[PDB]
């Protein structure tokens, strides 16, 4: 269950 709020940047 991945967190959609995790870091989306490089």
């Amino acid at each position, epitope marked *: 269950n991945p967190d*959609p*709020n*995790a*870091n989306p940047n490089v």
Partner: antibody
Amino acid sequence: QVQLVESGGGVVQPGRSLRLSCAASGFTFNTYGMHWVRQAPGKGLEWVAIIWYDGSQKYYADSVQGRFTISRDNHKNTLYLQMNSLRAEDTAVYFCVRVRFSVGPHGSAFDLWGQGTMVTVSS
Amino acid sequence: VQMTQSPSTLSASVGDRVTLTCRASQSISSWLAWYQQKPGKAPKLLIYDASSLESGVPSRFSGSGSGTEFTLTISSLQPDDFATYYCQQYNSYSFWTFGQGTKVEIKR
């Protein structure tokens, strides 16, 4: 300078499709997570979709799951929103939005917004 | 997570200290941001992580709070600070949700 410029908005019939585009310039666009956020007439801000910097994950608001797809071109520095099965409730200004860069495991606030492009859905 | 702002409108004058309130329906730690938006324009980030002043934002803006109770303060209202202010959470597993805004209007 550092900007986001949206285009593609217009008046469209319900059931039809429309593609929004957002041209980024002035920063290393292919290292940022990017969002679409929308604002219906007279209303507040509502999150629409997120795409990771490398396209590897995407998430969508309940109301657009199965209808909208977010994508990006990391060579042209462009963000897209393909909007299908449009309905009157989708009428809104759509903003492309950059997430503030962060180090570590967590995403951040929205530090850069485009001017917005208006989608009106009506028969 | 639902974000609730109060008051929905306030009336103020240039030079006034103004303080806006934002409440979260459940704890969001410090993953809270404030934005300013004027009619026909896009929002501008003011405060992130509940109390960090965004780069380039005037120093009259400050933010405070954690958990469920947050405030934004403008130490001294400037003539261009009349606008709507939104708070927004980006807590883990909570997506992104905004308060409904507080409009700061001109008193007369």
